[PDB]
Design a protein around this ligand. Structure first.
Ligand SMILES: Cc1cc(NC(=O)c2cccc(NC(=O)CCCN(C)C)c2)ccc1Nc1nccc(-c2cccnc2)n1
Length: 341
């Protein structure tokens, strides 16, 4: 109706409330817009027919519910949700309006970051992860493309991760289809931290096979104890791989990558390499926890003991049960969530 207008963005038609002006593409398809009612710049993400299949529906429903009930400084905040369509029968598209950030982490990694900026970004990432974990959300797919930053280096996680290709940041547990726990997300933090330091992707696998080879080449063949945690067919392949010693963390992250002009910087190089050695651990049973990572002397300098801890998200009733639905049930669930019914 007259409340909405249409603008062409890439291959997509954006039909948005008239409050949202001067849509520009960034990086669903996502636009920056000026919200004339808030008088602030916003991001608008279009979900096209999210109910059309159960996989898209589950992810879209979960994203709507979680972005609404989650309220944390390091998780992207919901401003608005709308559909241009007037009824359940005509319902097609969902628009999620969120806080506009300046860049994704991929852009920030290409800058010549010091210990101050790196440790501050990693502290915020770990804070965001700790909050998701407290809500029973284990992400499993954290990467530079789903973390955003403002020019003052404030950081926010964009989405809530996997149900239940760029695979550079996926933990061995994810790569090899293993059991996982909360510290699956520590691997991603380690990959990003290492990349910030080295200026290149740590494990740049071209496919699933190459991804595993890049990890074991750098870090070494994992212990026999780890091999017993694999599915039989996966265990055979992994054990059949050539043996690798890997490299010491001093050889993975040499001193020349860090400033060495003071005791402070010499200490920060040591602390950075120590935390890396504890996060980039193939065997999750020997890998640092998020709590331990936050308490690490590289990271804990950013902890303010006066800051009120955000309580766990109150996910209404159990509308995030892990139950499957028909396409028609998903459509009505998503529509109700958009309309507030
Ligand atoms: C304004 C803005 C700009 C961008 N810029 C880019 O995407 C960009 C620009 C240049 C180069 C690149 N390179 C790469 O990534 C390549 C990295 C390769 N390595 C992994 C090896 C990315 C990102 C987000 C925002 N702001 C914003 N705010 C709120 C929500 C959302 C949003 C976004 C996406 C989804 N949902 C919400 N975005």
């Amino acid at each position: 109706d007259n409340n909405f207008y249409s603008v062409e963005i890439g291959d997509s038609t954006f039909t948005v409330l008239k409050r949202y002006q001067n849509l520009k593409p960034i990086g669903g398809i996502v636009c920056a817009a000026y919200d004339a009612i808030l008088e602030r710049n916003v991001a608008i993400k279009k979900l096209s027919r999210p109910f059309q299949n159960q996989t898209h529906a589950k992810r879209a429903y979960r994203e709507l519910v979680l972005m609404k009930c989650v309220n944390h400084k390091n998780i992207i905040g919901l401003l608005n949700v709308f559909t241009p369509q007037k009824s359940l029968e005509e319902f097609q598209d969902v628009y999620i309006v969120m806080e506009l950030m300046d860049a994704n982490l991929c852009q920030v990694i290409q800058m010549e970051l010091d210990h101050e900026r790196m440790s501050y970004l990693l502290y915020q990432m770990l804070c965001g992860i700790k909050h998701l974990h407290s809500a029973g959300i284990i992400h499993r797919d954290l990467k530079p493309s789903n973390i955003v930053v403002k020019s003052d280096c404030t950081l926010k996680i964009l989405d809530f991760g996997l149900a239940r290709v760029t695979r550079y940041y996926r933990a061995p547990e994810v790569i090899l289809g293993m059991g996982y726990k909360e510290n699956v997300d520590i691997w991603s933090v380690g990959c990003i931290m290492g990349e910030m330091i080295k200026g290149g992707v740590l494990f740049p696998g071209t496919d699933h096979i190459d991804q595993w080879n890049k990890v074991i080449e750098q870090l070494g063949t994992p212990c026999p104890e780890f091999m017993k945690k694999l599915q039989p067919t996966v265990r055979t392949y992994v054990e059949n791989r050539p043996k690798y010693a890997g490299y010491s963390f001093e050889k993975l992250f040499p001193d020349v990558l860090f400033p060495a002009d003071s005791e402070h910087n010499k200490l920060k190089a040591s602390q950075a390499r120590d935390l890396l050695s504890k996060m980039l651990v193939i065997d999750a049973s020997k890998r640092i926890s998020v709590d331990e990572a936050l308490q690490h002397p590289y990271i804990n300098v950013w902890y303010d003991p006066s800051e009120a801890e955000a309580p766990p998200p109150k996910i209404p009733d159990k509308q995030l049960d892990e139950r499957e639905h028909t396409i028609e049930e998903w459509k009505e669930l998503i529509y109700k969530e958009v309309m507030d019914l």
